[PDB]
Write an enzyme that holds these catalytic residues in place. Structure first.
Site, PDB file in Angstrom:
ATOM      1  N   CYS A 197       5.718 -19.836  20.391  1.00 40.33           N
ATOM      2  CA  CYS A 197       4.545 -19.012  20.801  1.00 40.33           C
ATOM      3  C   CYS A 197       3.649 -18.777  19.592  1.00 40.33           C
ATOM      4  CB  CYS A 197       5.008 -17.685  21.450  1.00 40.33           C
ATOM      5  SG  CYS A 197       3.611 -16.579  21.788  1.00 40.33           S
ATOM      6  N   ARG A 232       7.392 -10.821  17.400  1.00 39.07           N
ATOM      7  CA  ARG A 232       6.973 -10.070  18.627  1.00 39.07           C
ATOM      8  C   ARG A 232       7.130 -10.978  19.831  1.00 39.07           C
ATOM      9  NH1 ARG A 232       2.388  -8.374  15.089  1.00 39.07           N
ATOM     10  NH2 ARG A 232       2.850  -6.421  14.500  1.00 39.07           N
TER      11      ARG A 232
END
EC number: 2.8.1.1
Length: 119
Positions: free
Chosen positions: A79, A84
């Site tokens: 990602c 996170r």
């Protein structure tokens, strides 16, 4: 001895070594990233995308795909964000997101080069 499901986390740094191996690189920066097209030596898509791939859009196919296959089954996924997003990927893993490597970043680094292959 099954290995069609293996979730792992790594950094574009180590993945880069694997990228030199010539393995498919899955990246999801944002649906709009698809509108831009593909990349040179980098396949960035929004997890699921409808196409000649046999129609597959994150909506219900997950039950059919997660049935025994992963949209990135045996692939290297990452990602745009790391840490996170690393825990965020875990949420998708519960829905069925394994058999691929989780890399941190991707387009941002590949973008540093400036060589995007696409139509």
């Amino acid at each position: 001895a099954e290995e069609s499901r293996v979730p792992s986390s790594v950094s574009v740094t180590v993945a880069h070594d694997l990228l030199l191996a010539g393995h498919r690189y899955l990246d999801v920066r944002t649906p709009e990233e698809f509108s831009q097209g593909h990349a040179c030596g980098a396949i960035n898509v929004p997890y699921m995308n409808r196409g000649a791939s046999g129609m597959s859009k994150n909506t219900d196919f997950l039950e059919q795909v997660s049935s025994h296959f992963g949209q990135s089954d045996n692939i290297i996924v990452g990602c745009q964000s790391g840490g996170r997003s690393i825990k965020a990927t875990t949420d998708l893993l519960h829905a069925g997101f394994t058999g691929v490597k989780d890399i941190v970043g991707g387009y941002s680094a590949w973008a540093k080069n400036g060589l995007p292959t696409k139509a």
